[PDB]
Amino acid sequence: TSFKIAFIQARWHADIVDEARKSFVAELAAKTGGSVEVEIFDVPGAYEIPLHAKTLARTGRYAAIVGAAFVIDGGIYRHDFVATAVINGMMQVQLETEVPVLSVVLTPHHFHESKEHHDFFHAHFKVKGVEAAHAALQIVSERSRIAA
Amino acid sequence: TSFKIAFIQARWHADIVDEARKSFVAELAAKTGGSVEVEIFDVPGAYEIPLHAKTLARTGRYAAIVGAAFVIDGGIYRHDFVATAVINGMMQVQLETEVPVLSVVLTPHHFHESKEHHDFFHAHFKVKGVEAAHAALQIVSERSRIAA
Amino acid sequence: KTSFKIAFIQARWHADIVDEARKSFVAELAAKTGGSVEVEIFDVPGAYEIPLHAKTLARTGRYAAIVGAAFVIDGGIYRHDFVATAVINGMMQVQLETEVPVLSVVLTPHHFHESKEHHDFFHAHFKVKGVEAAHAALQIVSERSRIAAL
Amino acid sequence: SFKIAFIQARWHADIVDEARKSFVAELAAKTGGSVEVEIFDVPGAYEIPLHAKTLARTGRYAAIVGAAFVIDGGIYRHDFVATAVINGMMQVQLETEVPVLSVVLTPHHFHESKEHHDFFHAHFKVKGVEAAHAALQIVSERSRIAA
Amino acid sequence: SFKIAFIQARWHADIVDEARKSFVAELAAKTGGSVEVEIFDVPGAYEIPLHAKTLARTGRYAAIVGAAFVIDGGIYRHDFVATAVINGMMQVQLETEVPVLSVVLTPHHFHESKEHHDFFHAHFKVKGVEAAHAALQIVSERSRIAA
Amino acid sequence: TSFKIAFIQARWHADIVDEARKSFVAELAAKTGGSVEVEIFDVPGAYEIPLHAKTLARTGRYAAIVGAAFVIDGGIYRHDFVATAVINGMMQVQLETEVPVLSVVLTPHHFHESKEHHDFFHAHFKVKGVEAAHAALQIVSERSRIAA
Amino acid sequence: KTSFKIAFIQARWHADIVDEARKSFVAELAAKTGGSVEVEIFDVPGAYEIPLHAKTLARTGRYAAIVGAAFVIDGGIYRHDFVATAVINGMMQVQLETEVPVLSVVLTPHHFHESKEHHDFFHAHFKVKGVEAAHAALQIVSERSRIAAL
Amino acid sequence: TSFKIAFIQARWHADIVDEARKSFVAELAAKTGGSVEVEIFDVPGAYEIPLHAKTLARTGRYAAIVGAAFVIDGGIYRHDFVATAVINGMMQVQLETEVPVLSVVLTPHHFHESKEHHDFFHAHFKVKGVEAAHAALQIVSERSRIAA
Amino acid sequence: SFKIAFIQARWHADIVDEARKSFVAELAAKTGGSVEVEIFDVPGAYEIPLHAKTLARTGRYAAIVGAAFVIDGGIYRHDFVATAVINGMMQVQLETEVPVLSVVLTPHHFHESKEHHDFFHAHFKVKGVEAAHAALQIVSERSRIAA
Amino acid sequence: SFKIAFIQARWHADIVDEARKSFVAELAAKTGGSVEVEIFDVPGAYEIPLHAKTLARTGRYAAIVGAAFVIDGGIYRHDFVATAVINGMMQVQLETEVPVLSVVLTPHHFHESKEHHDFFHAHFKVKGVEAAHAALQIVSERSRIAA
Ligand SMILES: O=c1[nH]c(NC[C@H](O)[C@H](O)[C@H](O)CO)c([N+](=O)[O-])c(=O)[nH]1
Ligand SMILES: O=c1[nH]c(NC[C@H](O)[C@H](O)[C@H](O)CO)c([N+](=O)[O-])c(=O)[nH]1
Ligand SMILES: O=c1[nH]c(NC[C@H](O)[C@H](O)[C@H](O)CO)c([N+](=O)[O-])c(=O)[nH]1
Ligand SMILES: O=c1[nH]c(NC[C@H](O)[C@H](O)[C@H](O)CO)c([N+](=O)[O-])c(=O)[nH]1
Ligand SMILES: O=c1[nH]c(NC[C@H](O)[C@H](O)[C@H](O)CO)c([N+](=O)[O-])c(=O)[nH]1
Ligand SMILES: O=c1[nH]c(NC[C@H](O)[C@H](O)[C@H](O)CO)c([N+](=O)[O-])c(=O)[nH]1
Ligand SMILES: O=c1[nH]c(NC[C@H](O)[C@H](O)[C@H](O)CO)c([N+](=O)[O-])c(=O)[nH]1
Ligand SMILES: O=c1[nH]c(NC[C@H](O)[C@H](O)[C@H](O)CO)c([N+](=O)[O-])c(=O)[nH]1
Ligand SMILES: O=c1[nH]c(NC[C@H](O)[C@H](O)[C@H](O)CO)c([N+](=O)[O-])c(=O)[nH]1
Ligand SMILES: O=c1[nH]c(NC[C@H](O)[C@H](O)[C@H](O)CO)c([N+](=O)[O-])c(=O)[nH]1
């Protein structure tokens, strides 16, 4: 259980996204005792994740890649076109690069830049991060077992 | 007609998903006296099914692959994105690998984590499993036919 | 040339309604081509199983066109659009990569609650779509044969 | 002086034609016949992508135009095809690298009523002219860029 | 120092423009002219993908930016195109592995009114800044994870 | 059980609406040997039914009133508003007048003025008419019962 | 007082499913009130015919509460919400003007395509709603009897 | 066929609304030769129509009242709350005042302040006006026949 | 120093209670016990309007508060009742002319999950305080106006 | 000369305010103070209807105006209230036959952002003007059709 993971994090809503990252890193720390290295990569926004993952993926250096971003409807434009582009983008890359790309590119039904909202997700992303943590291990692990 | 099917089950809502698997397997068993071997492959969540299926498909070890997951709207984030990515994912994969990927990656209009909803799908997935069984059989059968 | 083959891939969900499109489709060609055009029928579990089948059949080079027939309806339990999309996109993709025409008769109603009226309505309508399909098939296979490939 | 393949779906031809006629008219006007437009009949919008690809691959055309009226007729969902097509053309031009212009419009509402049929029979003439320019423009640009 | 191809749709040009002007401005106030931005005009958002692919292929650009205003004019559905363009770009940058930043905006509403116009006319300035930073940040990041 | 019913039919889509009337009347005729007299009242459109029903109801001349209309979305303006106003209207009216107002004021999810749609509803309204007939009978019957 | 009457007005559309709510409703009261509470049943064509009936019955003063039971479902042909609304509003209005409680068991599913699962599901569920109704009826009739009317 | 009609017209989108008025007046002119007087009343917006109709109605001076307004979604706020309030408002008034109130308070699915749009409705309202014209007569007439 | 009738639906009591407790707490705090709040249990939100009317008509209360959590449970449509209630209360206060405050909230989403139950158990405390103020305020205003 | 009761909800007060200030301003610049506007504060939009009924009853007002900003905060559904308030007002002015102008706005979107806030903060000024004119026009019209 010793391999590298490239955590790609969009910078939109950094405080929320960061919570997922921190939580991801911490959980793995607690499960693998650092035997799993998590390299963090910043990226402008979600849209920038697919390509970045593609690149970081083909380097062969990572057992899995994580895409973390908060794509929300800010009330002026439509966030879904990107969300789709990105959730699909990652799926495409991993299908190509055959390197697992876990998604922590969440899009909430509602997020109006309010305390309640902002606090809810600031907190939830932690949960999500832990989920991503386990998923990452589980997948990498099973692929290994699968591998011939 | 003695072959192997890869049953890739996501682990979210496992209790529900398992019902589709158990059913799927039991049907094939009954309908094929055991001729069909169904190898189970766990996976974090639906988003992990495509690649897994590609990886598993390309081994050529299986006559057909089944993607099983319950992708639901949990009232917090949007689920349709991943749902799409996966349903498309499996389609893409099977088109590349030329290996039948059956979809038991279901998305209900409503699943609110209540006795009713859970009881409903825990029960329904059994039906879907049986459906996937007959589908797998039928498709694997038809392909080999048009092959000759 | 007027003589060629068409692989008619039909999903078996709502087989009753899908069948009508087939029966109709075949009848139209027979009535137009006069048997000149052969329509081979392939059964498939559900619409999702159409893309790959169409691809495999397309690659055989035995057909001037493939036809995907299916009724992808919302059953009030799961969302049907996800598959419908994959299928409508799948056929589009298969035909795009295999350069073999794939006509869609994979219909998705706004409403279909399996009630006498609904069943009856579409059972009848699919006949119409089938005819349209036949004409489209002839039209497209033809138009392509007259293309200045330069 | 170049060739343009204009693929026109036949569903709602009365309306599709309208966009194609204005296209031909405009190019004829703006390029005085210099730019040739080859019209290609096609059953429905779904048949456009592949046709587009095939023609683009002949290398004969500077650009291709997909013209279709994909509307919601009240019985089935049109969006699935519309998507497969708007995406299909987009996919073909990205593949063949032959600009594919879209005149595959999908109205919010079109109920086969006089008001509607009349509105779009009219509006497609406008769209067709827009296609014309967009065509000329893009083709032009690709050269300015190729040099 | 590097170059950025800025492909801009011409629909709602005056609004799209603000995005560009701002982008070019911000970069100057950040690269002091180091980063050169070349503007390319294209008919509509649908015309961006292929252009960005073409320009990407050249290798002359560290990143490509697509700017367009794809709104619901109230007659046809714009989401089909919006989707195609957004995917298109993402697809192109994935093939060419050349960053393609999106400034292909689609507002929930835009009814050609003083209020609406004046709002995005100004907001595209903001977005253009964001597009500037993103480009710098992404182009920077890529080269880094490369060395 | 020999009484009068006021059948208020809007004239939009008359060809469709008439089918409900003709059917309504024929059913009562058959089921009541003519005992039930159904007086027909034309009206511009659905929006005109409520008042008309009030006016007609208050005469006390009728045991029950029927509002018949096809209120559809013609793709230009919104129909739901009037649809609502009328369906509520009839309800309001009957609650005031204490006179049963049956609703055959139908609104289809889709009616695009095509052979199919028209043929469909021209035929269906006949069924609805029959339904309204049995409803009228039943309701008038039940009321008089609880009256005794 | 524990002894009083309830007029249970039930629409006859989907009578099979509506009936379950009634059977259940009555059984619950009998199991709680022990016959102390009488439930008179009145049949009505459809939900739309509930408001006025409830009003007429309310005005009789014979009931401590009225209960409207109906399944107002989207049948994939016409919009059901218009009526559903009129009915849910109607009962609310009747009870408001007649000062007589009117409990709603006029349920409208997100989805009901008259398929085995759907029918079965609601056929069973209405039993639950019926129980809830009985409890609500008792609860409300009671709470009102303990109100300081000053 | 000699009576008075109070045409109440909101002033939002006056040019479009006006088309309905002009057309209304003209049609009646052509059918009743002025034997039907149409009194025009201006009103700020649609919301102001109900009360105005109520007042003008109770004066007993009019056989019918027409509400004309164009309530549209201007893209910033929601027009429906008003639309509903108004379409219901008129229905309520006429049910009260028992004076027919015809509705020419149209709400289009789309109207983005564009030439195509603006021209379409500038033209359609004429049609609608003619419809209102006939409806008005028909209703007033039938109510008369109905009257005892 | 006046009386307030607080009608609380019992569906999702755990959450409804939360809004009622904070209401009582606030008034007790702000009015030091001066303002009395009488709690009235009610089966569901639908039972509130009538109760509201009845109580308002006793003339005993300065204001009435309807508290309920009307949510979409995934099986039936909640909006019909929600409407009948938000309108019903509004109708009653317009009738009885006794201000009726609404704490009959309808969440966009509430799936009986921990995250949700926890969020609203929390948020209802906030709403309850808002009710408290709104109550005090409106009652106060009506007097300032009655004089 | 006459008086206009201006009931204003306090939610999003700063925005609602602009509406009022503008209204009062416009009237001054049109009645030179002839028309006196009395402001009444109320907790939320739901609290307007009854107040407008009460104030209407007084007879002291030629017209009543309800101003509120009822937006979708992203947690609960606001349309229930919006509807109740809008209907409420319309209902009240119908009973009391006292004009009740609505400045109870509900934006498609408003996510508590600089852009959103600043936009309605300014637009409510515009709306307030409209509300001014409408009041003058309606109060004028009524008295006319009365004489
Ligand atoms: O990560 C996000 N990026 C966003 N930007 C989109 C994209 O990721 C890039 O930043 C930029 O579009 C140019 O590529 C978002 N919105 O625009 O709303 C958002 O919500 N979340
Ligand atoms: O299998 C599922 N996975 C889900 N998670 C998405 C994905 O499968 C992975 O767990 C994770 O996103 C990292 O890839 C789901 N939802 O989020 O709702 C769901 O319903 N079902
Ligand atoms: O052909 C259809 N298949 C359906 N099943 C999906 C798919 O075609 C396969 O049967 C199965 O999913 C395994 O791939 C449908 N629905 O689920 O609703 C439908 O309407 N039509
Ligand atoms: O060009 C169109 N083709 C349509 N037909 C679909 C498709 O183009 C093909 O004719 C056929 O589906 C299979 O090839 C349409 N509808 O069905 O509604 C439409 O609106 N427009
Ligand atoms: O850039 C845009 N192009 C648009 N045209 C689509 C496309 O970009 C091309 O101009 C043309 O379709 C031919 O390809 C738009 N709409 O149609 O609404 C729009 O809003 N924005
Ligand atoms: O009876 C109808 N009347 C309609 N007109 C509305 C109303 O009935 C009157 O004709 C007119 O509005 C003046 O009151 C309709 N639409 O507008 O769509 C409809 O579908 N059905
Ligand atoms: O009780 C019901 N009545 C229905 N009919 C409406 C009404 O109740 C009367 O039967 C009839 O309309 C005459 O008033 C329904 N639908 O139409 O769907 C329904 O689901 N449930
Ligand atoms: O007649 C209209 N009035 C409108 N104003 C509403 C109302 O009629 C009054 O003018 C004002 O609200 C105060 O009463 C509209 N919009 O706001 O969008 C509209 O589209 N049409
Ligand atoms: O207070 C509530 N009551 C509910 N019950 C409805 C109503 O309040 C009565 O209990 C019953 O309908 C008849 O009196 C609810 N749902 O059904 O979902 C809900 O969310 N909230
Ligand atoms: O004026 C408003 N009041 C609101 N509160 C509703 C109501 O006005 C009262 O304040 C309270 O409900 C007690 O009656 C709002 N929301 O809840 O969203 C809003 O947006 N605007």
Side-chain angles (χ1 to χ4, degrees), chain H residues 10-13 44-48 69-74 79 82 86, chain J residues 100-103 127 131 134:
Chain H
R11 294 293 68 189
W12 276 64
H13 300 286
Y47 204 69
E48 284 65 71
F70 202 35
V71 178
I72 68 147
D73 189 321
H79 62 319
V82 175
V86 183
Chain J
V100 181
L101 297 71
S102 183
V103 187
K127 285 297 175 177

Side-chain angles (χ1 to χ4, degrees), chain I residues 64-66 86 89-90 93 99-105 127 130-132 134-135 138, chain J residues 8-13 16 42-49 67-74 76-79 81-82 85 104-107:
Chain I
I64 302 180
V65 184
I86 304 302
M89 293 187 286
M90 171 55 79
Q93 82 183 311
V100 174
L101 299 140
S102 182
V103 184
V104 179
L105 295 312
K127 303 301 290 186
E130 295 183 355
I138 197 56
Chain J
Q8 63 180 188
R10 291 296 74 196
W11 278 62
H12 310 285
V16 176
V42 87
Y46 202 56
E47 279 66 73
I48 297 178
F69 200 34
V70 178
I71 93 298
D72 188 317
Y76 316 93
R77 294 183 53 177
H78 61 314
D79 45 88
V81 186
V85 186
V104 165
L105 296 320
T106 294

Side-chain angles (χ1 to χ4, degrees), chain J residues 93-142:
Chain J
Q93 78 177 307
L94 279 190
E95 318 199 325
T96 68
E97 292 179 55
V98 185
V100 181
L101 297 71
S102 183
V103 187
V104 165
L105 296 320
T106 294
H108 289 310
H109 298 87
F110 183 84
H111 298 190
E112 284 168 44
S113 63
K114 182 63 175 166
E115 306 79 59
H116 279 307
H117 180 282
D118 294 340
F119 176 89
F120 294 86
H121 177 79
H123 205 249
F124 260 56
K125 183 172 193 174
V126 183
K127 285 297 175 177
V129 171
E130 301 178 0
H133 295 182
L136 293 176
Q137 296 172 38
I138 190 59
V139 171
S140 166
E141 190 67 341
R142 304 204 78 234

Side-chain angles (χ1 to χ4, degrees), chain D residues 95-111 113-130:
Chain D
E95 266 188 41
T96 74
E97 279 198 52
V98 177
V100 174
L101 299 140
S102 182
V103 184
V104 179
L105 295 312
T106 292
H108 280 306
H109 301 79
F110 186 74
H111 293 199
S113 66
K114 179 179 186 53
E115 293 88 316
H116 283 167
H117 189 293
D118 281 26
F119 180 87
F120 293 92
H121 179 90
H123 208 263
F124 262 49
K125 169 185 289 179
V126 167
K127 303 301 290 186
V129 163
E130 295 183 355

Side-chain angles (χ1 to χ4, degrees), chain I residues 91-103:
Chain I
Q91 182 199 328
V92 162
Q93 82 183 311
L94 277 190
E95 266 188 41
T96 74
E97 279 198 52
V98 177
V100 174
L101 299 140
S102 182
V103 184

Side-chain angles (χ1 to χ4, degrees), chain D residues 73-74 109-111 113-116, chain F residues 10-17 44-47 49 68-84 86-87 104-122 124-125, chain G residues 77-79 82, chain H residues 106-109 124 128 131:
Chain D
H109 301 79
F110 186 74
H111 293 199
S113 66
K114 179 179 186 53
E115 293 88 316
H116 283 167
Chain F
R11 295 296 62 193
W12 279 60
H13 303 294
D15 37 311
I16 303 283
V17 190
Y47 201 63
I49 295 179
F70 200 30
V71 171
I72 81 164
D73 187 328
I76 294 185
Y77 312 95
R78 290 187 51 178
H79 65 309
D80 58 295
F81 290 111
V82 170
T84 288
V86 176
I87 293 307
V104 186
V105 175
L106 282 23
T107 304
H109 302 290
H110 299 275
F111 189 84
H112 281 42
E113 273 166 57
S114 56
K115 194 65 168 66
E116 295 104 324
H117 286 324
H118 185 290
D119 284 6
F120 184 84
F121 294 94
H122 172 101
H124 208 218
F125 262 46
Chain G
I77 296 183
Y78 312 92
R79 283 186 50 179
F82 290 116
Chain H
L106 295 352
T107 292
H109 289 300
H124 209 244
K128 303 265 63 189
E131 299 188 353

Side-chain angles (χ1 to χ4, degrees), chain B residues 114-131:
Chain B
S114 56
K115 194 65 168 66
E116 295 104 324
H117 286 324
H118 185 290
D119 284 6
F120 184 84
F121 294 94
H122 172 101
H124 208 218
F125 262 46
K126 185 175 189 173
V127 178
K128 303 267 67 174
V130 172
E131 296 192 352

